[PDB]
């Protein structure tokens, strides 16, 4: 540990001040379990993807918007952002701003080219986190995140951010090794599965989400670009009613040694 001249107090205070700099609902850090002061002080919180070399970004000349004069939820036919969806065409969100039960794994939101305001109903992911979260130390896993408010099914939590890297860099970082990884493959679309999100040095609070074989949140691919399927938002949505102080977990598979989730249907392997 290169931070050995800092005290448990100052390191925790420094990480706390790092949390306070995050824009949006507050994020808190508690540790009533062991003596570790905080996660890595070198970690940087970000609000958007951290592209690296070799990662081709979407071309703005291929981008299209909708002509919705924001969009109307009771008339999804007029909006052109939902053309990739089969009939019955509908937005991914209901009147309460939550993802619908019948919505698939791909969410088509509006973008900066639409004639839309920032409070369009199809910009839930873009507006960002609304739930105050708390980072805490768990029993047998590392750090974890729990919600401080009730999160009914369909509530948007946050996105999995970090560096976007190529397959060669992902293998080069596939490994130090201690059973801890922050790599998240962008593999929602098999026709273009090339990049990986690395939350080691840059990332979101979702970087502390743990795995569970009976998860309460799940990933949705929030796509605001045209046909670009190599980079998209990894949006976490609650698939179960999450009560306050309940740990937020998702299936790393997507549906170190053994899994400590403690579910009655634990497969025993994280596979990630």
């Amino acid at each position: 540990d290169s931070y050995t001249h800092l005290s448990f107090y100052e390191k925790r205070e420094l990480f706390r001040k790092k949390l306070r700099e995050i824009e949006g609902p507050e994020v808190t850090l508690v540790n009533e379990v062991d003596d570790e002061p905080c996660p890595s002080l070198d970690f940087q919180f970000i609000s958007q993807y951290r592209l690296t070399q070799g990662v081709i970004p979407p071309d703005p000349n291929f981008q299209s918007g909708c002509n919705c004069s924001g969009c109307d939820l009771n008339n999804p036919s007029r909006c052109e952002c939902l053309d990739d969806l089969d009939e019955p065409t509908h937005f991914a969100y209901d009147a309460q701003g939550r993802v619908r039960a019948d919505t698939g794994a791909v969410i088509y939101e509006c973008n900066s080219f639409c004639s839309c305001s920032m409070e369009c109903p199809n910009r839930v992911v873009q507006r960002g986190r609304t739930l105050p979260l708390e980072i805490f130390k768990t029993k047998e896993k590392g750090w974890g995140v729990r919600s401080l408010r009730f999160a009914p099914a369909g509530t948007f939590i946050t996105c999995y951010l970090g560096e976007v890297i190529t397959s060669a860099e992902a293998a080069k970082r596939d490994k130090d090794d201690d059973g801890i990884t922050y790599l998240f493959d962008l593999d929602m679309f098999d026709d273009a599965s090339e990049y990986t999100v690395d939350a080691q040095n840059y990332g979101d609070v979702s970087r502390f989400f743990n795995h569970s074989c009976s998860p309460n949140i799940a990933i949705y691919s929030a796509v605001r670009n045209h046909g670009f399927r190599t980079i998209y938002d990894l949006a976490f949505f609650a698939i179960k009613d999450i009560q306050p102080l309940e740990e937020l977990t998702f299936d790393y598979a997507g549906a170190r040694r053994q899994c400590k989730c403690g579910s009655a249907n634990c497969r025993g392997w994280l596979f990630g």
């Binding site: 039960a101 019948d102 919505t103 698939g104 794994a105 791909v106 999995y160 992902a170 596939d174 990884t181 790599l183 998240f184 493959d185 962008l186 593999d187 929602m188 679309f189 098999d190 990986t196 799940a218 990933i219 949705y220 691919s221 990894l234 949505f237 698939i239 299936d251 790393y252 598979a253 997507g254 549906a255 596979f271 990630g272």
Partner: peptide, 15 residues
């Protein structure tokens, strides 16, 4: 395939 987190693909079962 990998020791990496996956989205599970877009095969529908209602995420």
């Amino acid at each position: 395939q990998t020791a990496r987190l996956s989205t599970g693909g877009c095969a529908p079962r209602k995420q």
